[PDB]
Design a protein around this nucleic acid. Structure first.
Ligand SMILES: [Mg+2]
Length: 246
DNA sequence: CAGTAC
DNA sequence: GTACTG
């Protein structure tokens, strides 16, 4: 029963096979064992108390409600703010393991200062229940990983990610968050072949690489207003989100 | 490293 | 593949 036990532990958020193997050696076999005796990060502690809820997929309708709960609270600061859900949701899946929401503003300035106030707003509402990786202040983008829950009876806690980008990077951001994961690797593995690089920030050309293929030059950023431009500059037929489910 | 996001 | 914090 070792293999089932490792799986049991691995389904905790913030716990992988290394920690599960450690917990197993300590003699833990149940979630209760982990809760009473094991040393936990705040993350792992949160994932342990939402273990059941976090295992469930959600109907995309509930995902929609979550996107609007974020969009409303966002536009309460600036009406011109854009909020797009880019998970399994954008790819059209009937179910979502989590909700991923991208946020930007067309003017390219008003996105600033929103991140902290938006999270604060959601917390007051009682929408955001716990924070995991409460922070990322990467470049011009910001990322939040957290736990939300819709108001009402019989509601499960859901995993919620929020990212905020400048409009100039909105295309590469949507691409990255929309996925899929295997699609992103494929696309970026390919750009690498063409002497280019792809990230959530920008598509770049003239990326220097050495004989080993290691990147030693960052190259230069190509302006990509929309997703379709990124596909074009990479010599690829544009794929709709539903065609990116690899 | 380990775990995570796509 | 790229890239973040625990
Ligand atoms: Mg896990």
């Amino acid at each position: 029963e070792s293999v089932p036990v490792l799986e049991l532990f691995s389904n905790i958020w913030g716990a992988g096979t290394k920690t599960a193997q450690m917990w197993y050696q300590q003699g833990f076999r149940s979630l209760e064992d982990i809760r009473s005796q094991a040393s936990l990060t705040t993350q792992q502690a949160i994932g342990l108390k939402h273990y059941s809820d976090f295992l469930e997929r959600m109907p995309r309708e509930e995902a929609t409600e979550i996107e609007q709960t974020v969009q409303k609270a966002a536009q309460a600061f600036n009406s011109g703010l854009l909020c797009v859900a880019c998970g399994s949701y954008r790819r059209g899946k009937a179910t979502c393991g989590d909700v991923d929401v991208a946020i930007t503003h067309p003017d390219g300035r008003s996105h600033r200062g929103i991140f902290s106030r938006l999270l604060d707003s959601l917390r007051q509402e009682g929408f955001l229940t716990d924070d995991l990786v409460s922070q990322e202040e990467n470049g011009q983008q910001q990322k939040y990983l957290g736990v939300c829950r819709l108001p009402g009876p019989g509601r499960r806690h859901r995993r919620l990610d929020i990212i905020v980008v400048p409009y100039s990077e909105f295309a590469c951001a949507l691409l990255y968050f929309t996925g899929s994961a295997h699609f992103n690797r494929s696309m970026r593995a390919l750009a690498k072949t063409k002497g280019m690089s792809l990230s959530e920030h920008a598509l770049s050309t003239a990326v220097v690489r050495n004989t080993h293929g290691c990147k030693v030059g960052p190259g230069r950023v190509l302006p990509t207003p929309t997703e379709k431009d990124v596909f074009r500059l990479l010599g690829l037929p544009y794929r709709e989100p539903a065609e990116r489910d690899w």
